[PDB]
């Protein structure tokens, strides 16, 4: 059968992380959260909340700057610092890294791999950052989702929180199983 990975970038966020997690848990569905280190270290209890509910945490860098032009040692500092915040909060080491803006080069791939991280982007983008209506977010996801889809969404967004129940309902009716990015890639 068909699998899809729902993903949320840029958290955690007071109020919203807990709300996203509760919706997923209420629907028997798991997702992948790509957290910014500066946010993660302010809110360790929210990291534990993501993982206690069966969700995966990935890195989204410490600072959330475009990493395209960083020196190798700064790429290391950005990833290693975030990996350490996450494992100190959850006891679970992340294995995935989504670069800010999806910007990368071969060196960032090599540094990520040397830290035991896979670089992941996405293949379905309903542009939920520059807030669309909840109906147009739903329709972009349901019109583009295929077996192996990795859906880019953003934490801390009421319009995204609003769209989740309809996305989960309709994809479940189309026979999709919801998996983590790690499970999807195997
Ligand atoms: Ni981001």
How would you summarize the topology of this molecule?
Blueprint (H helix, E strand, L loop, with lengths): L1 E8 L6 H11 L5 E4 L1 H6 L1 H9 L3 E4 L12 H19 L5 E2 L8 H9 L3 E2 L14 H11 L4 E6 L3 H16 L2 E3 L2 H5 L1
Parallel strand pairs: 1-2, 1-6, 1-7, 2-3, 4-5
Helix pairs in contact: 1-7, 3-4, 4-5, 6-7
The site of nickel (II) ion has 5 residues, from loops.
List keywords for this structure.
globular; binds nickel (II) ion; five-stranded parallel sheet; hydrolase activity, acting on glycosyl bonds; alpha/beta; 186 residues
Description of the molecule:
The protein is 46% helix and 16% strand. It has 186 residues and is of the alpha/beta class. The protein has one domain (1-186). Strands 1, 2, 3, 6 and 7 form a 5-stranded parallel β-sheet that branches. A two-stranded parallel ribbon has the order 4-5. Helix 1 (16-26) packs parallel to helix 7 (158-173), helix 3 packs across helix 4 and helix 4 packs parallel to helix 5. It starts with a strand and ends with a helix. The structure holds nickel (II) ion (NI). The PDB classes it as hydrolase. The entry lists the keywords Acetylxylan esterase, hydrolase. It forms a monomeric assembly. The entry is titled "Acetylxylan esterase from Caldanaerobacter subterraneus subsp. tengcongensis".
């Amino acid at each position: 059968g068909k699998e899809v990975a729902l993903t949320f970038d840029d958290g955690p966020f007071p109020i919203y992380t807990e709300k996203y997690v509760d919706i997923l848990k209420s629907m028997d569905v798991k997702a992948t959260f790509f957290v910014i280190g500066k946010h993660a270290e302010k809110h360790p209890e929210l990291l534990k909340y993501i993982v206690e509910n069966g969700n995966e945490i990935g890195l989204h860098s410490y600072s959330h700057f475009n990493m395209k032009k960083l020196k190798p040692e700064k790429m290391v500092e950005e990833l290693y610092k975030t990996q350490q915040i996450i494992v100190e909060a959850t006891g679970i080491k992340p294995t995935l890294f989504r670069p800010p803006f999806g910007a990368y080069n071969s060196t960032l791939i090599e540094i990520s791999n040397a830290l035991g991280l896979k670089v992941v982007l996405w293949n379905v983008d309903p542009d939920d950052w520059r807030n669309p209506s909840v109906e147009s977010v739903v329709n972009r996801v349901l019109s583009h989702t295929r077996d192996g889809s990795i859906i880019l969404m953003h934490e801390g967004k009421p319009s995204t929180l609003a769209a989740l129940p309809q996305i989960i309902k309709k994809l479940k009716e189309e026979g999709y199983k919801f998996v983590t990015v790690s499970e999807l890639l195997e």
